[PDB]
Structures are given as C-alpha cells and as structure tokens.
Amino acid sequence: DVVMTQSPSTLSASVGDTITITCRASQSIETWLAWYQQKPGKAPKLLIYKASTLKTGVPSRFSGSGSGTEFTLTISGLQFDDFATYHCQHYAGYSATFGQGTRVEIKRTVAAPSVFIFPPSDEQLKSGTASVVCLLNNFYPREAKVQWKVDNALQSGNSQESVTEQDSKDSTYSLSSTLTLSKADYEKHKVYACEVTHQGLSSPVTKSFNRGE
Amino acid sequence: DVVMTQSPSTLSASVGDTITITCRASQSIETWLAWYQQKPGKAPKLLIYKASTLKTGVPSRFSGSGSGTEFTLTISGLQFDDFATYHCQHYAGYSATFGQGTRVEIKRTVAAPSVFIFPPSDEQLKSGTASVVCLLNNFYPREAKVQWKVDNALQSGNSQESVTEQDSKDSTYSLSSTLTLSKADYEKHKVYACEVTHQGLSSPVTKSFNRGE
Amino acid sequence: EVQLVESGGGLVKAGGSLILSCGVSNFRISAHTMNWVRRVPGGGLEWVASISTSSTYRDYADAVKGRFTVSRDDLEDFVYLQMHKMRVEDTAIYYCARKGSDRLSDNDPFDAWGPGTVVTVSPASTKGPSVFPLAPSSKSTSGGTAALGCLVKDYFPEPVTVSWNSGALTSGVHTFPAVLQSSGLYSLSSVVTVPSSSLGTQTYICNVNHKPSNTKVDKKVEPK
Amino acid sequence: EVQLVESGGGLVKAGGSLILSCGVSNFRISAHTMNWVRRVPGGGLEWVASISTSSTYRDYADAVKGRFTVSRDDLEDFVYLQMHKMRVEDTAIYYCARKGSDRLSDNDPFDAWGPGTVVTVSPASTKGPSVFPLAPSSKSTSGGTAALGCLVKDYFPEPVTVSWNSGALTSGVHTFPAVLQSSGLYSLSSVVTVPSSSLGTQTYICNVNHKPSNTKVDKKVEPK
C-alpha cells in the first residue's frame, strides 16, 4: 500500500559525472529503503540498504541519503560499468515494493533512425510463413515506436521486436521488428508498410513495398 | 527392489464369466499386496488391500487371495462395468512397485481391419503442412502395427496414433494414424503408403497413392 | 559464494498454470525469509510473494493474491511458487531472492538473487480448430464399403464433439481420442464407413463443435 | 468426498524441467505419506516418489533418482514434484496419491488418487535454425548506405552467434537480442549497413553457428 515513485525514468549522462536519482514514497517509511543495480539479463545487485548503508564490496562512489518520503541515490564519478538500471525498494519484514526503475545511459545528441523494410524471402514463403522485418538503425534516445500497416490497416498482436544495447562507439540504439503472417494472409494484401515515430524526425517516416515487385 | 509380474497381459472374457488375474512377486512380500481398477482417462480405484481385504463399497464379486510370492484377483460374475485395466501393487512403508497391468476386454472372434488411406487436402497442403491419415476399421484383437513408407523408405518419429475403446455393439477396435510433413518435404516424394500388420491378416496390407493422382 | 537457481519457466496459455522452484548453494534457507520477484517487460521490478521462516507468514502482491501460492522446504532447501489462472501481465522474468544481511535482523534487504527464469503468458486462452476433408478414395469397391471423414487439427483445449449430418448418421461412426502435437495443440479424426453406392446421392457433412472457443464448423466431404 | 488435484502438466523438451503440484480437498495431508505415480503410454503404472509424514524420508524410483525431488507443505496442504533432465520415457500421466485407510497403520495402500496431469517430453532437446536472407532494397540511396541482413528463425535453445564474411566484416553489424515466438522457438535477425555501391562487388555471407544443435549455416545475401 506504499507506492514508490522513482525519478527520472531515464537519466542521460557522461563518464565522470556525478548524478542523482530520486525515490519518493507515498508515506513515511523511515529509512527502510534499499537501492539495487541491474544489468540487462542479469540478476539485481544490492548496493545500498537502510537508506544510506553500503554493502561490503560496493565502491564508495555510491551513496544514499534521505528519510521519511524523499530518498536520493548518488553516483559520484560515473564509470562505464555503472551504466545500468537502478531500482529503489521499500522493504518491510514480510513484503516489499519497488519503484518503476531508472535507466542510466550515455548522453549524446539526438539522432533520427535510418529505416529499412525487408519483404519475406521466396524460400520462406514456400514453407508457408511470411516474416516481414523493419529495421530502425542507429537512433537516440531509445524511445521509438514502430507501427505496421497492411493495406493501410493498422496491425496488432502479430509483431515482435528487440532492441540492442547502447553502441560502444556512437552510443546509439537500433531496433528490429518482425511482422509474421501465414502465406495465406500475406497474399491477401498488397502494400506492407512500417511507420516509425521518433523524437529525431520532424514527422513519422514510412517505408513500404508492394508484394510481388 | 521387488519385481512384480502380472499374468496375463490381456484377458479376453464374456459378460458373466469368472476370471483370475495372477500376480507373482520375485521374492516374498507376505501379504503386502493391493489390487487397483483403472478405466481409460480415469484415476485408479483401490479394490483390495492386504492381499485379500475388500475395501468398503467394492462389490463382493471381487476377491483376492495369496501370500508370499503368488497372488490372484478373482472376479466372479464379470459385469460390463468391470471391463477395465487391473493393477497389482506391492506397497511398503516408503515405496511401492506395480505389475505391468492386465487389460480385461470383451472376447470376440478375430477380425481383420479395413484399411483406408487419405491424402492431404489441397487446402491444408497450401498452408505448408501435409497430414496423411491411415484408417484401420473394426479389428480384433487390439494389437496392430502400422508402418508408413514414403517411396519405400520407412518413416520414424513423424506420426501419431489414436485407438478407440472397444465398440459397444461388435466389440472391435479402430485406429487412426496421422503422418505429418511440411509442404516442402511432402513434395520431395511420390508414393505414400501405410502398411498394416494384424493377427487377422494373412499377410500385411499396404494402401498407397501417388501424390497428384 | 551464495547462489540461487530458478526452475520451471516456459510458455503458458492465458488461464493456464505454471509452477516454479528455487534451489540454493552454500547456505541453508531455514533462517531466511524467501521471496519471489519479477521483472516485467517495461523493465521495472515487482515484489510477488514472500514466505517467512517456519512458514509462519505468507504475503502476496495484490495483483496475484488468490492466484499464486508460495511454499518452502527447509529440509532440502527449496522454495516453490505456484501460479494459477495466469494472465498476460504475469509475463516477466521471475527471481527468487533471499532476505538477509551480514547479521540477520527483523528487516533486511534482498542480499542474494537467482539469475531469473522467463515466464511468458500468451493472450489466447482458446483456439478454434481447422477442419480438412478426408475424401473417400475413388478406387472403392463396386457395391459398397467406402470410408470418409474429417480431420480436426490445431485446436486448444479439449474437448470437441463431432456429429455427422446433424445427428442423422450414427451407425459406423468412430471419433478418435484426440492427440497432443508437439505444437501444444490437439488433433483428432472422425470417420464413418458408408455404402460406396451412396456417394453422389447422400451428402455428408461433419459438424464440429469446439465449446471452449464457442466455434462451430460444417464441412462437406465429397469425392476427389 | 476426499479429493486431490494436480497442476503443472505440459509439454517439455528433452533435458528440460517441469514442476508439478498437488492440492487436496476435505482432508489434511499432515497425517498421510504422499506419493507420486505415473501411467506410461503402455498402460502400466510406475511408482515415482514418496515423502513421509513430517518429511522425514523421501524415496524415489531408480529411473528418476538424481532428477526428481518431492516436497510437502503441511500448512497449506500441497505436495510438489520437481522434474529435471527429463527424458522421453518420463512421458506419462502423473498422479498424486496418499497412503491411507479407515484407521492409519504402518503400511496402508494408496486409498485416494488425483485425476492426473499429462506430462509429455518431446524427443528433440534442440533444433537448428532456418536462415533466410534479408535482401537489400533495389531502390536504395545512390551513393552509399545500404542495409542487408540475415533472419535466423525457429531455433532452440539460445544462443546463436552470427559473424559476417567469416569475421572480416565487423563495422555496421547489429545482431539483435532474440525473441521468443509463441511457438516456443527463438528468432533473431542480424543486419549490416554497407556502401550502396558494393552490391554486386563485395559478396556478403552471414555465418550462423548454433552450438546447442551443432548446426552451422552460411548464407549468401544477394541483391533483389
């Protein structure tokens, strides 16, 4: 029944910086607050508990403060290993609640995606399935939307996507979306389009192809 | 680690008969023996325990005897609800061993199956999967072997069978085997066949068709 | 080095059930409150359930109260999570986490976590069958004895009922037990033997009813 | 009156894991030794595991020792069966059974059974990927910056690795995290951006390696 509100959702910074992540509780939780670090696909790692106590082995650049309803996680001198998601947590004797989480990334300038669309290969079509792929290449920041249109009819429930981690050299992201249809459905329609929305574009970009051409 | 051996594996009888299932133990288990009834798809039912003790509610036509290494379950005046599988069980404080089971069926005369083959429908074929169905109709006893051959090459691992329960009117069984292949696989071959072996057939019966007619 | 390892993740259909287990290395759980936590696709963590020492207290996230159960096995060091009536928003990575610290107290943080096991709930709780004809063979015997049927493929869950010509045709019909395919969908066939002389005079249509998806299909089966 | 019900059955691939649970109604398990039993497709029963009262003794069939664990939860009346390193011959209907009698003795038969839950182990423990070209666009930008790639589809389990031109091509390559399709198989794509004025000049071949199924696939991606 305690809602933990973490802020911000994304924190863009540079190596060497001192950054501050805020966590707010809907009611007083004294100092029963913990901070965790989590890397993609890895288990959470406890950094700070009792609001301000560091776990053994946690470098001193991490610190925490606050009591009652307002808490702060500080990282003084950001290193490469520190770009990750941070989670605040109210822990009670027999339950807990987490904040929404804060993703810390390397700051760079906005970059619009390059967009590409790939029709199904003839080989795949022969086996009864049609995967259409839309590529959003080297964009920043990470928030982007992909919309599939089939003969100008919005799709839903039939596409999946995955996103790469921030690039080692230009700190951008890329995204791949796959629309999957049966050979039967694919041949019922002619125009396949993926429409991309991203802060770097003056308006949405559409890439399309006509089946057969 | 006591080995329990039932006899017979299949017992063919008529309504009103008195039948005897034997259970032999590989070493003396005194009277630590129970008998269970089980119908297809249903839970085992405890009938007898301590070799000869009838569970409350179990009709008095069920009776168990034996000790040491040889045990018998006798049903006097077999009724239609008694056609089922019966399992003996050595039960110890912290483990048990079952026999292989005895299936009790209605006795009738040997009956060769009628064999039918069905190519895949064109509609299914187009979607990228080919199901070929072989039907064995009204045979007895239940044991039958079905082998698929595609251009004389024996198939393994790509078919499934289903058998009906004994027919209420003629006491026969029926069986369906489905061979499933991808469209691409299916079109790489010409002759599809299903070879049926059964005690009632003078020699195996092979039904075949050529893809495309 | 303390370790936890989850087991049991996989794909579940909405409404389905899935049970997870948690095993440990290099410590005993008896003194620890054990917890389940999940990371949802959006990236945030959600506390799911907790079980105290001695199983004195079990507590659950409101979103799962009534549908999940947590259990512990202090003697062999396992923790279990039962998930029933699973919902799409239960899709997440599930972690088993120990409540603990250098010296235990009445309220410690989660000091050790498992690597996580992926649990994915698909939106479809039901799927309607495809129906394909089993056409009678053209090379039948002159005089009678022909077989035809319907193939009922790729449905979920059981059962489906099959009638022929809305119940008018019952003699000689066999509807086989369904079989479960490697795809997780069922399939069965229904066949009937009829006089070969009747193809062309009597129309034959199999009536398939999949009540779980409230879907009905009538399929006319004709020669060739 | 006395009832049991099993949860957790499903389809699992050889080598995988699956956890089952068992609940009861109208009695408490605390006084009962609880058992797991399975009915194999041949029709016979096999005793699988037993856990005594107070969890003092746990016993397993030789076929499953080292792979299965049984646990009990007296406070909430549940029994668990963990199944790991599963094999084709574990395919069976699994039942939960109690030892009981009108008056409990030191050795009673299995007097109450659950209806059963179907466990199916498919034989293939891995499956190699199908690889398809992502052919670049004929109307790409004239002057440079074209994109092409490979779609690595329907494999299991993770991971695959992708290189381009046996490794000589590393700049502009993106291999994306795999997604889990509703079929329970994985799919991913790998793409590279290259000068639009190399199509027909430089050959591009993605090298896919799937160590879990010892499958290697080289695929040339050409324009069209």
CSV table of N, CA, C and O in Angstrom, one decimal, chain C residues 29-86:
chain,number,residue,atom,x,y,z
C,29,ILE,N,18.4,-22.2,3.8
C,29,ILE,CA,17.3,-21.2,3.8
C,29,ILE,C,16.5,-21.1,5.1
C,29,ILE,O,15.8,-20.1,5.3
C,30,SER,N,16.7,-22.1,6.0
C,30,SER,CA,15.8,-22.1,7.2
C,30,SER,C,15.8,-20.8,8.0
C,30,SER,O,14.7,-20.4,8.4
C,31,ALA,N,16.9,-20.1,8.1
C,31,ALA,CA,16.9,-18.8,8.8
C,31,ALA,C,16.4,-17.6,8.0
C,31,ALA,O,16.4,-16.5,8.5
C,32,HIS,N,16.1,-17.8,6.7
C,32,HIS,CA,15.8,-16.7,5.8
C,32,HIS,C,14.4,-16.6,5.4
C,32,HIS,O,13.8,-17.7,5.0
C,33,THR,N,13.8,-15.4,5.4
C,33,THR,CA,12.6,-15.2,4.7
C,33,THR,C,12.9,-15.3,3.2
C,33,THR,O,13.8,-14.7,2.7
C,34,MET,N,12.1,-16.0,2.4
C,34,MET,CA,12.4,-16.2,1.0
C,34,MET,C,11.3,-15.5,0.2
C,34,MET,O,10.1,-15.4,0.6
C,35,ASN,N,11.7,-14.9,-1.0
C,35,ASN,CA,10.8,-14.1,-1.8
C,35,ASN,C,10.8,-14.4,-3.2
C,35,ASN,O,11.8,-15.0,-3.8
C,36,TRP,N,9.7,-14.1,-3.9
C,36,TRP,CA,9.7,-14.1,-5.4
C,36,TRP,C,9.5,-12.7,-5.9
C,36,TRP,O,8.7,-11.9,-5.4
C,37,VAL,N,10.3,-12.3,-6.9
C,37,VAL,CA,10.2,-11.0,-7.6
C,37,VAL,C,10.3,-11.2,-9.1
C,37,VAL,O,10.8,-12.2,-9.5
C,38,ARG,N,9.6,-10.3,-9.8
C,38,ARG,CA,9.6,-10.4,-11.2
C,38,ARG,C,9.9,-9.1,-11.9
C,38,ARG,O,9.5,-8.0,-11.4
C,39,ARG,N,10.6,-9.2,-13.0
C,39,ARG,CA,10.9,-8.0,-13.9
C,39,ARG,C,10.0,-8.1,-15.1
C,39,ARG,O,10.1,-9.0,-15.9
C,40,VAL,N,9.1,-7.1,-15.2
C,40,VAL,CA,8.1,-7.1,-16.3
C,40,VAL,C,8.8,-6.5,-17.5
C,40,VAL,O,9.8,-5.8,-17.4
C,41,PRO,N,8.2,-6.7,-18.7
C,41,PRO,CA,8.9,-6.2,-20.0
C,41,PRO,C,9.3,-4.7,-19.9
C,41,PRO,O,10.4,-4.4,-20.4
C,42,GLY,N,8.5,-3.8,-19.3
C,42,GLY,CA,8.8,-2.4,-19.2
C,42,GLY,C,10.1,-2.1,-18.4
C,42,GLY,O,10.5,-1.0,-18.4
C,43,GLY,N,10.6,-3.1,-17.7
C,43,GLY,CA,11.9,-3.0,-17.0
C,43,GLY,C,11.8,-2.9,-15.5
C,43,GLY,O,12.8,-3.1,-14.8
C,44,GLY,N,10.7,-2.6,-15.0
C,44,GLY,CA,10.5,-2.4,-13.5
C,44,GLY,C,10.4,-3.8,-12.8
C,44,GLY,O,10.0,-4.8,-13.4
C,45,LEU,N,10.8,-3.8,-11.5
C,45,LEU,CA,10.7,-4.9,-10.7
C,45,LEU,C,9.4,-4.9,-9.9
C,45,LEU,O,8.9,-3.8,-9.5
C,46,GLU,N,8.8,-6.0,-9.6
C,46,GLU,CA,7.6,-6.2,-8.9
C,46,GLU,C,7.7,-7.3,-7.8
C,46,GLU,O,8.0,-8.4,-8.2
C,47,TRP,N,7.6,-6.9,-6.5
C,47,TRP,CA,7.5,-7.9,-5.5
C,47,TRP,C,6.3,-8.8,-5.7
C,47,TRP,O,5.2,-8.3,-5.9
C,48,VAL,N,6.4,-10.1,-5.7
C,48,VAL,CA,5.3,-11.0,-6.0
C,48,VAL,C,4.8,-11.8,-4.7
C,48,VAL,O,3.6,-11.8,-4.4
C,49,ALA,N,5.7,-12.4,-4.0
C,49,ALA,CA,5.3,-13.1,-2.8
C,49,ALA,C,6.5,-13.3,-1.8
C,49,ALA,O,7.6,-13.3,-2.3
C,50,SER,N,6.2,-13.4,-0.6
C,50,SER,CA,7.2,-13.7,0.5
C,50,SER,C,6.7,-14.7,1.4
C,50,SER,O,5.5,-14.8,1.7
C,51,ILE,N,7.6,-15.6,1.9
C,51,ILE,CA,7.3,-16.6,2.9
C,51,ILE,C,8.4,-16.5,4.0
C,51,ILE,O,9.6,-16.6,3.7
C,52,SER,N,7.9,-16.3,5.2
C,52,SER,CA,8.8,-16.1,6.4
C,52,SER,C,9.4,-17.4,6.8
C,52,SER,O,9.1,-18.5,6.3
C,53,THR,N,10.4,-17.3,7.7
C,53,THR,CA,10.9,-18.5,8.4
C,53,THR,C,9.8,-19.3,9.0
C,53,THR,O,8.7,-18.8,9.4
C,54,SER,N,9.9,-20.7,9.0
C,54,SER,CA,8.9,-21.6,9.6
C,54,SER,C,7.6,-21.5,8.9
C,54,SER,O,6.6,-22.2,9.4
C,55,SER,N,7.5,-20.8,7.8
C,55,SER,CA,6.2,-20.6,7.1
C,55,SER,C,5.1,-19.9,7.9
C,55,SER,O,3.9,-20.1,7.7
C,56,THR,N,5.5,-19.2,8.9
C,56,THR,CA,4.6,-18.5,9.8
C,56,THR,C,3.7,-17.5,9.0
C,56,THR,O,2.5,-17.4,9.2
C,57,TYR,N,4.4,-16.7,8.1
C,57,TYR,CA,3.6,-15.7,7.4
C,57,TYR,C,3.9,-15.9,5.9
C,57,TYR,O,5.0,-16.1,5.5
C,58,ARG,N,2.8,-15.8,5.1
C,58,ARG,CA,2.9,-15.8,3.6
C,58,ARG,C,2.2,-14.5,3.2
C,58,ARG,O,1.0,-14.3,3.6
C,59,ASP,N,2.8,-13.7,2.4
C,59,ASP,CA,2.2,-12.5,1.9
C,59,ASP,C,2.4,-12.4,0.4
C,59,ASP,O,3.4,-12.9,-0.2
C,60,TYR,N,1.5,-11.7,-0.3
C,60,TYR,CA,1.4,-11.7,-1.7
C,60,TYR,C,1.1,-10.3,-2.2
C,60,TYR,O,0.4,-9.5,-1.6
C,61,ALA,N,1.7,-10.0,-3.4
C,61,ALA,CA,1.2,-8.8,-4.1
C,61,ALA,C,-0.3,-8.9,-4.4
C,61,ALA,O,-0.8,-9.9,-4.7
C,62,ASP,N,-0.9,-7.7,-4.3
C,62,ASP,CA,-2.4,-7.7,-4.6
C,62,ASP,C,-2.7,-8.3,-5.9
C,62,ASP,O,-3.7,-9.0,-6.1
C,63,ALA,N,-1.9,-8.0,-6.9
C,63,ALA,CA,-2.1,-8.5,-8.3
C,63,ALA,C,-2.2,-10.0,-8.4
C,63,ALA,O,-2.8,-10.5,-9.3
C,64,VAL,N,-1.6,-10.7,-7.4
C,64,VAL,CA,-1.6,-12.2,-7.5
C,64,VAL,C,-2.3,-12.8,-6.3
C,64,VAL,O,-2.4,-14.1,-6.3
C,65,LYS,N,-2.7,-12.1,-5.3
C,65,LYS,CA,-3.4,-12.7,-4.2
C,65,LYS,C,-4.5,-13.5,-4.7
C,65,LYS,O,-5.3,-13.1,-5.5
C,66,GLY,N,-4.6,-14.7,-4.2
C,66,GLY,CA,-5.7,-15.7,-4.6
C,66,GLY,C,-5.3,-16.5,-5.8
C,66,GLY,O,-6.0,-17.6,-5.9
C,67,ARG,N,-4.3,-16.2,-6.5
C,67,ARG,CA,-3.9,-17.0,-7.7
C,67,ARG,C,-2.5,-17.6,-7.6
C,67,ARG,O,-2.3,-18.7,-8.2
C,68,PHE,N,-1.6,-17.1,-6.7
C,68,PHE,CA,-0.3,-17.6,-6.5
C,68,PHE,C,-0.2,-18.2,-5.1
C,68,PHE,O,-0.9,-17.8,-4.2
C,69,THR,N,0.7,-19.2,-5.0
C,69,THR,CA,1.0,-19.7,-3.6
C,69,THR,C,2.5,-20.0,-3.5
C,69,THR,O,3.1,-20.5,-4.5
C,70,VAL,N,3.1,-19.6,-2.4
C,70,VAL,CA,4.5,-19.8,-2.1
C,70,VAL,C,4.6,-20.8,-1.0
C,70,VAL,O,3.9,-20.8,0.0
C,71,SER,N,5.6,-21.7,-1.2
C,71,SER,CA,5.9,-22.8,-0.2
C,71,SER,C,7.4,-22.9,-0.1
C,71,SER,O,8.1,-22.5,-1.0
C,72,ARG,N,7.8,-23.4,1.1
C,72,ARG,CA,9.2,-23.6,1.3
C,72,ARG,C,9.5,-25.0,1.8
C,72,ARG,O,8.6,-25.7,2.4
C,73,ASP,N,10.7,-25.5,1.6
C,73,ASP,CA,11.2,-26.8,2.0
C,73,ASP,C,12.5,-26.6,2.7
C,73,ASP,O,13.6,-26.6,2.0
C,74,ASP,N,12.5,-26.4,4.0
C,74,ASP,CA,13.7,-26.1,4.7
C,74,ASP,C,14.7,-27.3,4.8
C,74,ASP,O,15.9,-27.1,4.8
C,75,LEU,N,14.2,-28.5,4.7
C,75,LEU,CA,15.0,-29.7,4.8
C,75,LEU,C,15.9,-29.9,3.6
C,75,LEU,O,17.0,-30.4,3.8
C,76,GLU,N,15.4,-29.7,2.4
C,76,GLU,CA,16.1,-29.8,1.2
C,76,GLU,C,16.5,-28.5,0.5
C,76,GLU,O,17.0,-28.5,-0.6
C,77,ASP,N,16.1,-27.4,1.1
C,77,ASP,CA,16.4,-26.0,0.7
C,77,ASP,C,15.8,-25.7,-0.7
C,77,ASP,O,16.5,-25.4,-1.7
C,78,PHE,N,14.5,-25.8,-0.8
C,78,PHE,CA,13.8,-25.4,-2.0
C,78,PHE,C,12.7,-24.4,-1.6
C,78,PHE,O,12.1,-24.4,-0.5
C,79,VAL,N,12.3,-23.5,-2.6
C,79,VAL,CA,11.2,-22.6,-2.5
C,79,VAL,C,10.4,-22.8,-3.7
C,79,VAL,O,10.9,-23.0,-4.8
C,80,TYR,N,9.0,-22.8,-3.6
C,80,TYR,CA,8.1,-23.0,-4.7
C,80,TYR,C,7.2,-21.8,-4.9
C,80,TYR,O,6.9,-21.1,-4.0
C,81,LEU,N,6.9,-21.5,-6.2
C,81,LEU,CA,5.8,-20.6,-6.5
C,81,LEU,C,4.8,-21.3,-7.4
C,81,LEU,O,5.2,-21.6,-8.5
C,82,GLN,N,3.6,-21.4,-7.0
C,82,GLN,CA,2.5,-21.9,-7.8
C,82,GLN,C,1.8,-20.7,-8.5
C,82,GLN,O,1.5,-19.7,-7.8
C,83,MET,N,1.7,-20.7,-9.8
C,83,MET,CA,1.0,-19.7,-10.5
C,83,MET,C,-0.2,-20.3,-11.2
C,83,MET,O,-0.1,-21.2,-12.0
C,84,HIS,N,-1.4,-19.8,-10.8
C,84,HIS,CA,-2.7,-20.3,-11.4
C,84,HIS,C,-3.4,-19.2,-12.1
C,84,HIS,O,-3.2,-18.0,-11.7
C,85,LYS,N,-4.4,-19.5,-12.9
C,85,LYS,CA,-5.2,-18.5,-13.6
C,85,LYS,C,-4.3,-17.4,-14.2
C,85,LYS,O,-4.6,-16.2,-14.0
C,86,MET,N,-3.3,-17.8,-14.9
C,86,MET,CA,-2.2,-16.9,-15.3
C,86,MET,C,-2.8,-15.9,-16.3
C,86,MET,O,-3.6,-16.2,-17.2
